[PDB]
Amino acid sequence: LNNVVAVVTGAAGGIGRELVKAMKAANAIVIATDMAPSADVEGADHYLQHDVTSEAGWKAVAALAQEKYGRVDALVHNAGISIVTKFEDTPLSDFHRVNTVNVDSIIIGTQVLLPLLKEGGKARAGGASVVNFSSVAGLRGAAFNAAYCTSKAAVKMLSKCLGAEFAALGYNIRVNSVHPGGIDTPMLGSLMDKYVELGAAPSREVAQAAMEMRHPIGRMGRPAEMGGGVVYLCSDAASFVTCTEFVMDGGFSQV
Amino acid sequence: LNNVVAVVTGAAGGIGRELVKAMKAANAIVIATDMAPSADVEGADHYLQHDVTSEAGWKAVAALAQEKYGRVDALVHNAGISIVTKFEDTPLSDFHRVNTVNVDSIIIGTQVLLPLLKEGGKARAGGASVVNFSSVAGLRGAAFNAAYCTSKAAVKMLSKCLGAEFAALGYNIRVNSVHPGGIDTPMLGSLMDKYVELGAAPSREVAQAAMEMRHPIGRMGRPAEMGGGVVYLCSDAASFVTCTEFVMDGGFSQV
Amino acid sequence: ALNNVVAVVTGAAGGIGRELVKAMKAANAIVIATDMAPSADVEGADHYLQHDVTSEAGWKAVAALAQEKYGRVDALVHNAGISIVTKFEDTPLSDFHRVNTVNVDSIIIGTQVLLPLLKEGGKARAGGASVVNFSSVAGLRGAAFNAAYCTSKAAVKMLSKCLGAEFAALGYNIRVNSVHPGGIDTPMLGSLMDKYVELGAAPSREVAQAAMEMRHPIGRMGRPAEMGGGVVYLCSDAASFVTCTEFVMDGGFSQV
Amino acid sequence: ALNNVVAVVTGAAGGIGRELVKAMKAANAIVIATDMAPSADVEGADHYLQHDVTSEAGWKAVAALAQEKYGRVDALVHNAGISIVTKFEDTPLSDFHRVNTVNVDSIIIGTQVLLPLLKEGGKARAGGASVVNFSSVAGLRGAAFNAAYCTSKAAVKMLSKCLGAEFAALGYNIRVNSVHPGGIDTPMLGSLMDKYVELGAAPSREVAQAAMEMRHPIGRMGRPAEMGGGVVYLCSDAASFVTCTEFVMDGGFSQV
């Protein structure tokens, strides 16, 4: 990932934090972001208090990189929220509230960074790499998981839309969705806990008697293994990778 | 489909009326609902003017089935929109306008027809049949169908999540998904005008053939051909057909 | 709807074998049910023939009748299946080959011998002649102790769409549809778990059946009867435009 | 991280095969490259062998070189391919079988005989060893005049969701993965578009060439070289939690 201007949202969460530091490990010129003021950022040159649900937010991202590097050669649409809760008890406003961050996190972003992710596509042979974080829960939907699965199913599909159309409009901006599994983040630290609140679990360790084993590979993911193809995608390695479904899920779904 | 109190939104759609007709030879009690005040909706047995995202509107359709029968066996949504648009020029409103008529017509409407749906699986062994139309475009990427495909993707996914959640909470309601290709409808129609106005297809003759040749069946799907697959869905012959990418394309996808 | 439809169903004296015939006759299309059984008590099945489905000499004899007796086939039904449950490391090469042979080659030879009698299907119903390839969720998804089995099914799976696409824009009118049945109750499936326990993967045959049923959101397995109308539908012309399809009748099992 | 990783590589003299080699020694992993070709100057490759993959002999020709010289296999590769286009109704079952053993059996004795060293390959390495099989677009979506091919590449796809799932639930650390490439311009994929005239698929050769080009949302025909990158990933332990799943390098083809 040499001479590549990047950016990554949500990179102060479990997966987020690593993606920045293992993208300077990739030696890409990262810019980090998160909802928060400012704290400890490793590798990344610059940070922005960011919420992928804030249009004005995003501009600040464009105008920065604009001055800062004058191009954008990567984009990891990452920041997103996972929720588990009774459907005939969930409002429509909850349903949007998920999409807001997970789906319309991708769009307003990439619309704002569109003048930029142009320039970046041109100055590299492989292209401007665009990475959306869907899931396995966007591949296979889950029970009591209704609005969380429809999120990553759009984060599945929007990608195809973004690769093929951008290809259409000439641009060389590769787009590719991302499909993790039941990642060990403190988010999921209290999401099995929410399978409990819906009865399907006597205790927290009996729902944590499902997620690892729905994986053949037999264990909760770790937020380390996830950067490996993320750099890959962003780099002229995956030059010929568009529209794709990049899946790292312990063989969760195949089975 | 004996003793089938069944609901058919957008019954004045190209596909709409022909499902209405093709459920009568099966001998079902149809309920035609649409945006129009009253037309000659051929086949139906009770007609409503029905805004498909109006919450209190699905309470006038839950009203009648409650009135006349006190059960809902089948639930078929249909009123589904497609914009053709330049992704970077697309309003988010208009992105927000499609998830609403389509994806968000399920989250509301089922809840209001849910009371009479848990009745269906008690009145019928083969259960209660909920059919959100998805489509091929909500399976696979299609540029300048940028705000249309993501929709039916969740329409693809939720179907799953609902159907799964209901069966996990021992409702006898199954939920499937129909995925028609470029169906000889006034929807497959004048969107080839949009393509044209985009200046994206040269002519409709071109546009016709691009949507003709992506099916190696050559023809683009007659609305009554989808009749069979709907019927099967509703029946107790489809009592093991839940949460399915049961297809009807003529060859748009698998190749 | 099955009118005028001369059909060939294999594995007829099987479970899903018996039932397919029943429902097709219940729609009232001329079944020509076939199996390896020397003779078979099959409700309605207008015909019965000892037919080895790997054997060419087999489909020959199928075709003799279907020509002489109707001079066409309107619905070819490869239901003829075996299942092999075994560790890849221990699975002989030929075990792989015995399976594919019976479940893919079986299918291949007759869509080649009965292909003549299918081209008239191209003619006798505009709604094409209905090829009904029985894959499975093994054809859909993967499994431990089902190596050769799933691979075999996924050839069936794929062969279908090859035949959906070829037989189409060659003018031949023939739809090829792929049924992928989920857990279906037979002294086939009611004993395919034994093996996992025979291996020892599961302690008991109760537990063999446990996660079996629960791996479908619906929570149970399938009736032989609950595999009925899906063939009928494919063989019904309500779907003249429905080919290359994985017709998934598994109880959502795959999708979640 | 392709360091202290002993590979094995088939279809070596093949055009992609060659790209795959360079792009893995310039990552500093320990190559054992294999092919049937009599003579091969396989750039990057530490060792070349003359190997028949429809042969446990050929496969135990590999095994000794990894037996004697090293003591493990960390990245076995199965890269051989035949790419037949045939009329379904002009494929003998033999021509069906020829495209089995080179394409599917090759992966079996590759993985039955090398299984010990795959295990030994999975002990020093974190997320484990990987088998990174080579299917094809054909192996996922369908296409005409690829009957025996698109199956053969489907019988890859699935075999490996079998093999992925069977080893992990065996307490080995020996991952199994697959790629499905799109249109890669090679002499391997060379004048095969002539066939799409000898039958009559599209008028000429260069509009058959651009007919293949058309489909691709990416717009262009890939390169042999491009595969290697998405092969250099899967093998490394930074692609540890990638198993059973179908890593895709097609250029958008499948996705629209």
The DSSP string of D164-185 is HHHHHTTT--EEEEEEEE--B-
DSSP-based three-state secondary structure for D146: coil
Q: What is the dihedral of CA D177, D183, D186, D189, to 10 degrees?
A: 90
User: Do C245 and C211 belong to one domain?
Assistant: no
Q: Looking at beta carbons, which residues of chain D come within 8 Å of B141?
A: 217, 252, 255-256
Beta-carbon contacts of residue C103 (< 8 Å; ≥ 6 apart): C80, C81, C82, C152, C153, C155, C156
Whether A26 maps to a domain, the answer reads yes
Full strand arrangement of the beta sheet holding D246-249: D7-8, D75-76, D129-134, D174-181, D246-249
- CA nearest neighbour of A68 among A126, A6, A15, A151: A6
Cβ–Cβ under 8 Å, residues B49 and B34: yes
For D209-216, the CB contacts below 8 A with 24+ separation are D212/D183, D213/D183, D215/D183, D215/D253, D216/D182, D216/D183, D216/D251, D216/D252, D216/D253
How far, in Å, CA of B90 to CA of B88, rounded? 6
> Hey, how many other C-beta atoms are within 10 angstroms of the C-beta on D235?
26
How far, in Å, CA of A110 to CA of A76, rounded? 10
Whether A47 maps to a domain, the answer reads yes
Give, rounded to a whole angstrom, the gap between the first and last alpha carbons of chain A.
34
Cβ–Cβ under 8 Å, residues B62 and B113: yes
How far, in Å, CA of A135 to CA of A155, rounded? 8
CATH code of A106's domain: 3.40.50.720
Where b means 16+ CB within 10 Å and e means fewer, C144-158 reads bbbbbbbbbbbbbbb
Beta-carbon contacts of residue A243 (< 8 Å; ≥ 6 apart): A159, A160, A163, A164, A175, A176, B141, D217, D252, D254, D255, D256
Polymer length of chain A:
255
Whether C255 maps to a domain, the answer reads no
User: Do C58 and C18 belong to one domain?
Assistant: yes
> Hey, how many other C-beta atoms are within 10 angstroms of the C-beta on B14?
16
- Answer whether A210 touches C (CB < 8 Å): no
- CA nearest neighbour of C35 among C24, C50, C45, C21: C50
Where b means 16+ CB within 10 Å and e means fewer, D49-73 reads bebbbbbbebbeebbebbeeeeebb
Structure tokens at D237: 């332990």
- Number of H helices and number of E strands within chain D? 9, 7
Resolution in A: 3.3
Q: Looking at beta carbons, which residues of chain C come within 8 Å of B163?
A: 217, 252
Nearest residue on chain D to C245, alpha-carbon basis: D142
User: CB B158 to CB A146 under 8 A?
Assistant: yes
Look at strands B173-178 and B128-133 and give their pairing.
parallel
Whether B40 maps to a domain, the answer reads yes
- CA nearest neighbour of A114 among A85, A75, A145, A149: A75
Cβ–Cβ under 8 Å, residues C8 and C15: no
User: Do C128 and C189 belong to one domain?
Assistant: no
How far, in Å, CA of B57 to CA of C14, rounded? 51
Residue D162's identity, in one-letter code, is C
Polymer length of chain C:
256
For A61-66, the CB contacts below 8 A with 24+ separation are A61/A7, A61/A31, A61/A33, A61/A109, A61/A112, A61/A113, A62/A112, A62/A113, A62/A115, A62/A116, A64/A31, A65/A5, A65/A7, A65/A31, A65/A113, A65/A116, A66/A116
> Crossing angle of helices D147-168/D93-100, nearest 10°?
40
CA distances from B6 to A28, B27, B230 (A): 57, 11, 11
Whether C2 maps to a domain, the answer reads no
- CA nearest neighbour of C236 among C13, C23, C60, C19: C23
How far, in Å, CA of B110 to CA of B108, rounded? 6
C-alpha radius of gyration, chain D, whole number: 18
How far, in Å, CA of C20 to CA of A67, rounded? 70
**Phi, psi angle pair for A176, to nearest 5°:** -155, 130
User: Do C204 and C112 belong to one domain?
Assistant: no
Q: Looking at beta carbons, which residues of chain D come within 8 Å of A181?
A: 241
Whether D239 maps to a domain, the answer reads yes
**Phi, psi angle pair for D87, to nearest 5°:** -50, 130
Q: Looking at beta carbons, which residues of chain D come within 8 Å of C146?
A: 162
- CA nearest neighbour of C213 among C179, C246, C190: C190
- CA nearest neighbour of D244 among D181, D169, D185, D193: D169
- Give residues preceding each break in chain C, C–N over 2.5 A: none
Q: What is the number of alpha carbons within 13 Å of residue D171 lying toward its C-beta?
A: 1
Residue owning tokens 């699935």:
D158
> Crossing angle of helices C147-166/C93-100, nearest 10°?
40
Interface partners of chain A (CB pairs < 8 Å, 3 or more) are B, C, D
User: Do C103 and C67 belong to one domain?
Assistant: yes
How far, in Å, CA of B218 to CA of C35, rounded? 36
Cβ–Cβ under 8 Å, residues D222 and D185: yes
- CA nearest neighbour of B51 among B5, B117, B108: B108
> Hey, how many other C-beta atoms are within 10 angstroms of the C-beta on B112?
18
Beta-carbon contacts of residue B207 (< 8 Å; ≥ 6 apart): B192, B195, B196, B201
Residue window 130-159, chain D: list those with CB within 8 Å of chain B.
Answer: 141-144
Cβ–Cβ under 8 Å, residues A218 and A49: no
Cβ–Cβ under 8 Å, residues D27 and D51: no
Burial (Cβ within 10 Å: 0-12, 13-18, ≥19) of residue B184: middle
Cβ–Cβ under 8 Å, residues A80 and A8: no
Whether A201 maps to a domain, the answer reads no
> Hey, how many other C-beta atoms are within 10 angstroms of the C-beta on B119?
21
Where b means 16+ CB within 10 Å and e means fewer, C169-185 reads ebebbbbbbbbbbbbbb
Which structural domain, as residue segments, surrounds residue C175?
Answer: 7-183+224-249
Consecutive H or E run containing A129: strand A129-133
Give, rounded to a whole angstrom, the gap between the first and last alpha carbons of chain B.
33
**Phi, psi angle pair for D240, to nearest 5°:** -75, -45
The residue annotated as part of the active site, out of A148, A171, A195, A232, is A148
**Phi, psi angle pair for B154, to nearest 5°:** -70, -40
How far, in Å, CA of B185 to CA of B208, rounded? 13
> Hey, how many other C-beta atoms are within 10 angstroms of the C-beta on B45?
15
How far, in Å, CA of A107 to CA of A55, rounded? 10
Q: What is the dihedral of CA C134, C140, C143, C149, to 10 degrees?
A: 30
User: CB D93 to CB C104 under 8 A?
Assistant: no
Nearest-CB residue to D256 (from B140, B254, B255): B140
How far, in Å, CA of B235 to CA of B129, rounded? 8
User: Do C216 and C152 belong to one domain?
Assistant: no
How far away is chain D from the Cα of B86, in angstroms, using its nearest Cα?
Answer: 16
- CA nearest neighbour of C1 among B132, B237, B74: B237
B196 annotated to a ligand binding site: no
Beta-carbon contacts of residue C1 (< 8 Å; ≥ 6 apart): C27, C236, C237, C238
Cβ–Cβ under 8 Å, residues A238 and A228: no
Ramachandran class of C71: left when φ > 0, alpha when ψ lies in -120 to 50, beta otherwise: left
C164 annotated to a ligand binding site: no
C-alpha radius of gyration, chain B, whole number: 18
How far, in Å, CA of C72 to CA of B143, rounded? 44
Give, rounded to a whole angstrom, the gap between the first and last alpha carbons of chain C.
32
Binding residues of D for NAD(+): 15-16, 35, 52-53, 79, 81, 135-136, 149, 153, 181-182, 184, 186
Concatenate the DSSP letters of all residues of C212-224 into one string.
HHHTSTT-S-B-S
- CA nearest neighbour of C180 among B198, B214, B246, A146: B246
How far away is chain B from the Cα of A200, in angstroms, using its nearest Cα?
Answer: 9
Burial (Cβ within 10 Å: 0-12, 13-18, ≥19) of residue A54: middle
User: Do C152 and C48 belong to one domain?
Assistant: yes
User: CB C240 to CB B247 under 8 A?
Assistant: no
User: CB A240 to CB D222 under 8 A?
Assistant: yes
How far, in Å, CA of B114 to CA of A88, rounded? 9
User: Do C67 and C109 belong to one domain?
Assistant: yes
Structure tokens at B233: 């869905």
A185 annotated to a ligand binding site: yes
User: Do C83 and C124 belong to one domain?
Assistant: yes
How far, in Å, CA of B66 to CA of B69, rounded? 6
DSSP A238: G
Residue owning tokens 């959502």:
C252
How far, in Å, CA of C20 to CA of C44, rounded? 11
User: CB C255 to CB A142 under 8 A?
Assistant: no
| Residues facing A75 on adjacent strands | A130
CA B35, distance to chain mean position in Å, is: 15
How far, in Å, CA of C251 to CA of C136, rounded? 12
DSSP-based three-state secondary structure for C208: helix
| Residues facing B6 on adjacent strands | B30
Please tell me the total count of domains within chain D: 1
Q: Looking at beta carbons, which residues of chain B come within 8 Å of A164?
A: 141-143
Consecutive H or E run containing C164: helix C147-166
Whether B203 maps to a domain, the answer reads no
Instruction: Give Dmax over CA atoms of chain C in angstroms.
Output: 55
Look at strands A74-77 and D47-50 and give their pairing.
unpaired
Consecutive H or E run containing A106: helix A104-112
Beta-carbon contacts of residue B112 (< 8 Å; ≥ 6 apart): B55, B58, B59, B61, B62
Concatenate the DSSP letters of all residues of chain B into one string.
-TT-EEEETTTTSTTHHHHHHHTTTTT-EEEEEESSS----TT-SSEEE--SS-TTTHHHHHHHHHHHTS---EEE--------B-TTT--HHHHHTHHHHTTHHHHHHHHHHHHHHTTHHHH-SS-EEEEEE--GGGTS--TTBHHHHHHHHHHHHHHHHHHHHHHHTT-SEEEEEE-B-S-TTTTTTTHHHHHHHTT-SS-HHHHHHHHHHTSTT-S---TTTTHHHHHHHHSSTTTT--S----B-SSSS--
What is the 3 state secondary structure string of C35-81? Answer: ECCCCCCCCCCCCEEECCCCCHHHHHHHHHHHHHHHCCCCEEECCCC
Residue owning tokens 């992966």:
D107
Residue window 229-248, chain B: list those with CB within 8 Å of chain D.
Answer: none
C84 annotated to a ligand binding site: no
| Residues facing D134 on adjacent strands | D179
Ramachandran class of A185: left when φ > 0, alpha when ψ lies in -120 to 50, beta otherwise: beta
